[PDB]
UniProtKB/Swiss-Prot annotation, chains A, D:
The keyword Cell wall biogenesis/degradation does not apply. The gene is VMA1. Pfam families: ATP-synt_ab (PF00006), ATP-synt_ab_N (PF02874), ATP-synt_ab_Xtn (PF16886), ATP-synt_VA_C (PF22919), Hom_end (PF05204), Hom_end_hint (PF05203). Keywords: Acetylation, ATP-binding, Autocatalytic cleavage, DNA-binding, Endonuclease, Hydrogen ion transport, Hydrolase, Intron homing, Ion transport, Membrane, Nuclease, Nucleotide-binding, Phosphoprotein, Protein splicing, Translocase, Transport, Vacuole. GO terms for molecular function: ATP binding; DNA binding; endonuclease activity; mRNA binding; proton-transporting ATPase activity, rotational mechanism. It comes from Saccharomyces cerevisiae (strain ATCC 204508 / S288c). This is V-type proton ATPase catalytic subunit A. It catalyses: ATP + H2O + 4 H(+)(in) = ADP + phosphate + 5 H(+)(out). InterPro entries: ATP-synt_VA_C, ATP-synth_a_Xtn, ATP_synth_asu-like_sf, ATPase_a/bsu_AS, ATPase_F1/V1/A1_a/bsu_N, ATPase_F1/V1/A1_a/bsu_N_sf, ATPase_F1/V1/A1_a/bsu_nucl-bd, ATPase_F1/V1_b/a_C.
From Swiss-Prot, chain B:
It is found in: Vacuole membrane. Belongs to the V-ATPase D subunit family. V-ATPase is a heteromultimeric enzyme composed of a peripheral catalytic V1 complex (components A to H) attached to an integral membrane V0 proton pore complex (components: a, c, c', c'', d, e, f and VOA1). Interacts with RAV1 and RAV2 components of the RAVE complex, which are essential for the stability and assembly of V-ATPase. Subunit of the V1 complex of vacuolar(H+)-ATPase (V-ATPase), a multisubunit enzyme composed of a peripheral complex (V1) that hydrolyzes ATP and a membrane integral complex (V0) that translocates protons. V-ATPase is responsible for acidifying and maintaining the pH of intracellular compartments. This is V-type proton ATPase subunit D.
Curated annotation (Swiss-Prot), chain C:
GO terms for biological process: ATP metabolic process; endosomal lumen acidification; Golgi lumen acidification; intracellular calcium ion homeostasis; pexophagy; proteasome storage granule assembly; proton transmembrane transport; transmembrane transport. GO terms for cellular component: cytoplasm; cytoplasmic stress granule; fungal-type vacuole membrane; Golgi membrane; membrane raft; proton-transporting V-type ATPase complex; vacuolar proton-transporting V-type ATPase complex; vacuolar proton-transporting V-type ATPase, V1 domain. Belongs to the ATPase alpha/beta chains family. This is V-type proton ATPase subunit B. Keywords: ATP-binding, Hydrogen ion transport, Ion transport, Isopeptide bond, Membrane, Nucleotide-binding, Phosphoprotein, Transport, Ubl conjugation, Vacuole. The lineage of its organism: Eukaryota, Fungi, Dikarya, Ascomycota, Saccharomycotina. The gene is VMA2. HAMAP family: ATP_synth_B_arch (MF_00310).
From Swiss-Prot, chain E:
It is found in: Vacuole membrane. V-ATPase is a heteromultimeric enzyme composed of a peripheral catalytic V1 complex (components A to H) attached to an integral membrane V0 proton pore complex (components: a, c, c', c'', d, e, f and VOA1). Interacts with RAV1 and RAV2 components of the RAVE complex, which are essential for the stability and assembly of V-ATPase. This is V-type proton ATPase subunit B. Coiled coil: none annotated. It comes from Saccharomyces cerevisiae (strain ATCC 204508 / S288c). ATP binds at R122. Non-catalytic subunit of the V1 complex of vacuolar(H+)-ATPase (V-ATPase), a multisubunit enzyme composed of a peripheral complex (V1) that hydrolyzes ATP and a membrane integral complex (V0) that translocates protons. V-ATPase is responsible for acidifying and maintaining the pH of intracellular compartments. The chain holds residues 260 to 388 of 517 of the full protein. The lineage of its organism: Eukaryota, Fungi, Dikarya, Ascomycota, Saccharomycotina.
Length: 593, 45, 457, 593, 129
């Protein structure tokens, strides 16, 4: 149909376009590379072609698909690995003998090879149905049906034909819909453009616990179900590490991992590691992976795949939420997504803003976060779901004022830090309290108090300790440890202990084991207890030396507690933590008189 | 971390402060060490 | 057709529209000399070429253009070691010719097949600070961050030469079972540098071990960018077709980045942060993506890029970008160099986040990783104490701090201090490392698991 | 030929310019001003005209010279002051009654009044002769090697006409060469474009030093021919002195002095001073100037000549390298050559990189360093010659963290730190052992050990002793010198003699700033033997006061070492040092016992 | 604001209008005009950013004949945490004083966490009842 007028860089101009929508997907040239229409100048439409071009001729054919860059939502997304332009990566390996994308491959959006078992819904013939309703379900996992087959949004009618229970393939018809005669047939998959968010019934308040399973978050600033999060940091920050832990431990029923332009070895590691390791609520065959789907993309792999990653992933997440699942979406990193834009603004010749990144940055990040939150699912059964977004970014040389980090921080309500100095001693991730806040902290403590722990009371003293520690440390540096008071010495020690035992997730035998809110609470009871009794003791006359040497064993025990597997009496209160409480009491008394 | 606009005004006066202060602290140390040598000898006597 | 005009490294051709992107063209000068270039931008009845070779002398209707009608691919053979080549797709040194059994593209996806399975095999440099504190794997990417007062070439050569002697000791251990190949590419460095490198490889072993691509600073920036691409084709073939582990030493990586910077200055392309391109991310990526295990899973390409920092800052765009992408960071310090430590590698900010992938356990200890973390932690405390020793004096520092100041001094002068040909096995390094840990008491070593400390002390 | 389309500033565009190369020398207008075509857009050539384009209407003719802008290489270089694109300043003084060259005044690069005596080589008609082979020579010097005439590089053939012995003019033909009909005629000079490096048989690394004749250069970190070196700027209260002294004391076969874009006080000083001063090896006929060829630009000269300045000088240096000579290129300053690039960029409209300096900067420096170095000279019986670049890089932002300095140091392997406080007090040179380095040390120290000196032992030890002295000096301030051993006091005592004799040399006296490379080694020998013996003797029972009285005469000699003559029987073995050694051994038995 | 003018003037209401968040308004200004003839000012923020601002401030103030008022409390978020940045800087010149928050109190845990040292209103003495 159209004919290539020019290729200047990855940017292609082709005449004989009478139309085309925004960001319309095309297959360009005989090669059949990915593209999207960004703009139209005259009859000539400028289309960026984002798969590497080293050999596209002028006057090669241009085929419009007729709809924007879109995603399929349907059966077999779980335990199936995809790119950001929704090509199954497994399908490519077999055919192509190119494990990664080579230049010029056209592989359909889903797997049309794997038959799936369809069972019929509470909607039988003659019944009205509307988008996001559970028309049926597909068995995908050993424990649960993952993919609840939804009628798509922006479709409606009464069902003339319901296919019976049995096996069918993806392209075969299984549903016929009545509304102005045959409105159309439906297939197992449905399509949606990824620049349109999916519509919900209502959004609902975020105040319900999100257990990410990592001690350091639970202790300092927990997230919420419905959360939005920013995390900075630059290599040796433990972001890959916290993703793997996050996937294993996560209470959410789906986790969607987004690789924005990753090392490739990093993607190779996490893929291998989900079936090698076991889940905490049990998992039969590829345990963790059963709950994990990967969108993975490397650093030179298509600029479209990388740009679309956050939208392909957020659309997936919204679909699981409309299904009635709790989703934890990890994107890593939005900063690598931001580089895809920096590149897009130069090529096109549009004028950018500061740091050579465009101004449209701020809108695009904001749109992604607002589609997240906790909501009541669209569809007649009605369920509760969430999309809680944890989004990684990277500072430009210790500069946190770079447009990407500042923008994400603008939109977020939770900020979790990352300190370079503390990572060097091996404490990554490294969250303090002067580089981090959470608005959810206040409601979240109220909900944890209820469940069992004393957390809110301990949280306040814990915050104070860290806040004083920093200030007191500046005096040690400059003046020396000769200007201190004895209570201030106490604040320094307890603090050093907190730094190691929560923030560090680095091994010494084994990478640290699942620590819940309950575990995390016990650690806090022992550190806070140490501090109170010791200050009383010094106030009331007593040696510093006597008190520190005496705590001794108790300190070794809390350090290593996290390596030991949870439950050692109970999850709730361990016998190992219970006993220390007595030891402090016995010491306090010896010291006083 | 820090402002990207007009940190130069506060920082410039600090920097000067520091090198100027350092020079001056050295003179106060030099005087203190100056007297110290003298009294050590006088005290033994 | 004929040259229309020339504006810097960009050449304006008035031509006809049949050419494809990166299709080779040859510029015929009136001297009858041919130089090669590839079309960077094509439009109707005209082209913009960037010429690899030269950038001046280009005429109008006295000059002519001829089309090759093949977009650039590198002629790759597996008989490339020992053979001298020049960074231009052919030797202009008059060295043994390249030959071709495949011609492979440098776009960054020819047929590219990489890691679906992460590195697990340890590869040693014979140097303790590298191996123990960070570890190197059969796909690991580690940047050598160097300076204008450090001698970058001496360290570059040091790491490579000593990793060739260790690597067959590791073959016998059954860490490996396949060949080792070196691919050395020097791009746009001085003559003095080029000569030096060749001399170094000969002394240690031979130059049969390595393949050489030589590019001279007097040759353009456009040449310099193609120079690593040539290295990548060499390495991917060897891994793919003949199940060899390939080690690439890419010097200087900074040289390549400045080149990118020049084709946005004498272009109308608006640059990003600190005058370095906006599409700088993609240019760098191309080198780093083409790494890891190669299909069959006995072949590999492992990367050690060599960066020289000009300002020596960690706010400069080149060191920052590289670091996020690469699997490790090795920081080499001017202050150690001055003091008389060779190698003078500071591990204070050397970190790997893919620390697990980097270490080995089936041809290295399991204790290797546990000890390294503790060492790093104890080094760091020893640095905090060093600043405090200058300020406060010894007139208030604590009993615990004193142990940490001693550890710091013993650590620089024994562990990081090694002979020019003295190679240490990874197991022997543990014994050395255990000597360093041994002065601290069992209550200072509290962070480590009890099992390990009672076992090995 | 072409017709002027526009004159917008000093940039002039011209149409109807075909077969116009991209380095093409052109003469603009009726006046014939020098210009060169930087760019071409279409039919129109964009020219930077270096001279004032005042009086130039649109429609004036543009006449191609028919070839790039080249420089002439041949007889009658030495004892001439030149422009940045080689135009004799001296010749303008005769004609014009001007120092400088004013607009509309051009002249040829070599004088045609002067005639030189051409002597044939070892090739006669009918012989095949090859690129660079020695076709003849001219002798016009007796103090140094003269201008040996080569067959032009990249030129081969059989010689139809070899002119016999006699005087010919530089202009006049002396060769016709048969290579595809008459190849052309050639003359006594050859033209070479200066933005093209000259070939040589092969280039090698450096290994070969020569007489620097400034003690501090050799002693602290050796000075090598075929080297790359950075020297700090001072803007003529410190810069000028070291430059004048390096030209005068170094008895390198040639010296090529390039002032890139200087104050004009410094240019004025170097020209008047060179005939006035005496050679350090004997001979008259304007001593130092006869060895010197000068390119002298103040900042006032055209900007293309300032940019060109180093390129022309480097070609000059490279030409003499094929004759087999050792050259010092002393260039001052690269920051000022860099300033030209910045100016030329803004005029074109080129977008630069950091601090306003282009991106052509880093590659142009790398290309520049490599032209300089050691090489086996081209020409049939082969010789060795060198080109050593010492380039000053001054403040360009008021710091040394600016792009010009930071780029160069990296390619450079040598830094020599001038000291300001000592420089303001007029000790020149006074190099700081703290900041300085040479990466050439190793290969060189091995070279001198071969030749006859004990050089590796003494140089290394020189450095250690001084470094050590700063650290011991601090123990004297804070604890006291009295509580410290005799050994430590000695370490300092010796460092002060090493500092006084070498480092604090005065380039206003020739018995205090001119001594041969052997002589400089003999002095250093003297101090080291004393250090060891002094520490040996205090251990066997001596005191600082006792030691000082006892050494006496040898200590006084070493203090007086610099005042001594460059010879005593030879200028390579100074008999007074060899006998001093005996007096030291005899003194050590007496002192110790 | 047009709606506030209706109530304040026709039916004599005291209107307090809260306009949140001015940072989102400011950003919008930058993204537009990357394809008009008009071409942004200082740091990619419009030079005519001031004109935009002033259109919002136009419909605020006391009303003639003293039927009602519109009072306006805008909320600005400093994105770089400096007031030398465009959003606080241009806005601050128009505005009759400013109340600037405090980062330090917040960390402590205080609410509302503002500070009084950067906060000043010039027309304070004459205005009040």
């Amino acid at each position: 149909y159209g004919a290539i007028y020019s290729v200047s860089g990855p940017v292609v101009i082709a005449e004989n376009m009478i139309g085309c929508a925004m960001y319309e997907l095309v297959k360009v040239g005989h090669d059949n590379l990915v593209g999207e229409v960004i703009r139209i100048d005259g009859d000539k439409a400028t289309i960026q072609v984002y798969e590497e071009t080293a050999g596209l001729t002028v006057g090669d054919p241009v085929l419009r698909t007729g709809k924007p860059l879109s995603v399929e939502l349907g059966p077999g997304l779980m335990e199936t690995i995809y790119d950001g332009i929704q090509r199954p990566l497994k399908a490519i390996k077999e055919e192509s003998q190119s494990i990664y994308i080579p230049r010029g491959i056209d592989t359909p959006a889903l797997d049309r090879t794997i038959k799936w078992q369809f069972t019929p819904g509470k909607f039988q013939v003659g019944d009205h149905i509307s988008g996001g309703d559970i028309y049926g379900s597909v068995f995908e996992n050993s424990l649960i049906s993952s993919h609840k087959i939804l009628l798509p949004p922006r479709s409606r009618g009464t069902i003339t034909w319901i296919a019976p229970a049995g096996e069918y393939t993806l392209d075969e018809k299984i549903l016929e819909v009545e509304f102005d005669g045959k409105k159309s047939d439906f297939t197992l998959y449905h399509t949606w453009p990824v620049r349109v968010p999916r519509p919900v019934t209502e959004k609902l308040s975020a105040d319900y616990p999100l257990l990410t399973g990592q001690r350091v978050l639970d202790a300092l600033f927990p997230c919420v179900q419905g959360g939005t999060t920013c995390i900075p940091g630059a290599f040796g920050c433990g972001k890959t590490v916290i993703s793997q832990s996050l996937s294993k431990y996560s209470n959410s029923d789906a986790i969607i991992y987004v690789g924005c332009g990753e090392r490739g070895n990093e993607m190779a590691e996490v893929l291998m590691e989900f079936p090698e390791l076991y889940t905490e609520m049990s998992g039969t065959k590829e345990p963790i992976m059963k709950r994990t789907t990967l969108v993975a993309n490397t650093s030179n792999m298509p600029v479209a795949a990388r740009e679309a990653s956050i939208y392909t992933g957020i659309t997936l997440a919204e679909y699981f939420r409309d299904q009635g699942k709790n989703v934890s979406m990890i994107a890593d990193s939005s900063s690598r997504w931001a580089e895809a834009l920096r590149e897009i603004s130069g090529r096109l010749g549009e004028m950018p803003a500061d740091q050579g990144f465009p101004a449209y940055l701020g809108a695009k990040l904001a749109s992604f976060y607002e589609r997240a939150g906790k909501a009541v699912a669209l569809g007649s059964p009605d369920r509760t779901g969430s999309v809680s977004i944890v989004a990684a970014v990277s500072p430009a040389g210790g500069d946190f004022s770079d447009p990407v980090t500042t923008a994400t921080l603008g939109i977020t309500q939770v900020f979790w830090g990352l300190d370079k100095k503390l990572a060097q001693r091996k404490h990554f991730p490294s969250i303090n309290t002067s580089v981090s806040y959470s608005k959810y902290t206040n409601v979240l403590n109220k909900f944890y108090d209820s469940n069992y722990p004393e957390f809110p009371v301990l949280r306040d003293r814990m915050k104070e300790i860290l806040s004083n520690a920093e200030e007191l440390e500046q005096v040690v540096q400059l003046v020396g440890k000769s200007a201190l008071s004895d209570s201030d010495k106490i604040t320094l020690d307890v603090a050093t202990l907190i730094k190691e035992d929560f923030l560090q997730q680095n091994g010494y035998s084994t990478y640290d084991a699942f620590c819940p809110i309950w575990k995390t609470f016990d650690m806090m009871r022992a550190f806070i207890s140490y501090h109170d009794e010791a200050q009383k003791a010094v106030a009331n006359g007593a040696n510093w030396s006597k008190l520190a040497d005496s705590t001794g064993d108790v300190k070794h025990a809390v350090s290593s507690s996290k390596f030991f597997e949870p439950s050692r009496g109970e999850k709730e209160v361990h016998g190992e933590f219970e006993k220390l409480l007595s030891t402090m009491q016995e010491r306090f008394a010896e010291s006083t008189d | 971390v820090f402002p990207t606009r007009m940190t130069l005004g506060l920082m410039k006066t600090k920097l000067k402060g520091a090198n100027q202060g350092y020079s001056l602290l050295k003179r106060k140390s030099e005087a203190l060490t100056k007297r110290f040598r003298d009294i050590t000898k006088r005290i033994d006597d | 057709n004929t040259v229309s005009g020339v504006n810097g490294p960009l050449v304006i051709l008035e031509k006809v529209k049949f050419p494809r992107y990166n299709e080779i063209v040859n510029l015929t000068l009136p001297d009858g000399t041919v130089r090669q270039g590839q079309v960077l931008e094509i439009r109707g009845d005209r082209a913009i070429v960037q010429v690899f070779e030269g950038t001046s002398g280009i005429d109008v209707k006295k000059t002519t253009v001829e089309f090759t009608g093949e977009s650039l691919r590198i002629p790759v053979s597996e008989d490339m070691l020992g053979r001298i080549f020049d960074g231009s797709g052919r030797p202009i040194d008059n060295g043994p010719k390249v030959f071709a059994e495949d011609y492979l593209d440098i776009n960054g996806s020819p047929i590219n097949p990489y890691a679906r399975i992460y590195p697990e095999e340890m590869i040693s440099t014979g140097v303790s600070a590298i191996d123990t504190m960070n570890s190197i794997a059969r796909g690991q990417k580690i940047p050598i961050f160097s300076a204008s007062g450090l001698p970058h070439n001496e360290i570059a050569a040091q790491i490579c030469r000593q990793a060739g002697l260790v690597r067959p000791t590791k073959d016998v251990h059954d860490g490996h079972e396949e060949n080792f190949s070196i691919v050395f590419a020097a791009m746009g460095v001085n003559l003095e540098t080029a000569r030096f490198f060749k001399q170094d490889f000969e002394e240690n072993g031979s130059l049969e071990r390595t393949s050489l691509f030589l590019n001279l600073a007097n040759d353009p920036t456009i040449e310099r960018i193609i120079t690593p691409r040539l290295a990548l084709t060499t390495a991917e073939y060897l891994a793919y077709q003949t199940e060899r582990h390939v080690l690439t030493i890419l010097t200087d990586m900074s040289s390549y980045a400045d080149a990118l910077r020049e084709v946005s200055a004498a272009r109308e392309e608006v640059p990003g942060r600190r005058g370095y391109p906006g599409y700088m991310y993609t240019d760098l990526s191309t080198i780093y993506e083409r790494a890891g295990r190669v299909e069959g899973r006995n072949g590999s390409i492992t990367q050690i890029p060599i960066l020289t920092m000009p300002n020596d800052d960690i706010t400069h765009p080149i060191p920052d970008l590289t670091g996020y992408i690469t699997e490790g960071q090795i920081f080499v310090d001017r202050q150690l160099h001055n003091k008389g430590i060779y190698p003078p590698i500071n591990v204070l900010p050397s970190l790997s986040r893919l620390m697990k992938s980097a270490i080995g356990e089936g041809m290295t200890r399991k204790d290797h990783g546990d000890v390294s973390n503790q060492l790093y932690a104890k080094y760091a405390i020893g640095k905090d104490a060093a600043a405090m020793k200058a300020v406060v004096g010894e007139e208030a520092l604590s009993i615990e701090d004193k142990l940490s100041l001693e550890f710091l001094e013993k650590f620089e002068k024994t562990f990081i201090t090694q002979g020019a040909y003295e190679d240490r096995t990874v197991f022997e390094s543990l014994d050395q490392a255990w000597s360093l840990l041994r002065i601290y008491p069992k209550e200072m070593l509290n962070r480590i698991s009890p099992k390990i400390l009672d076992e090995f002390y």
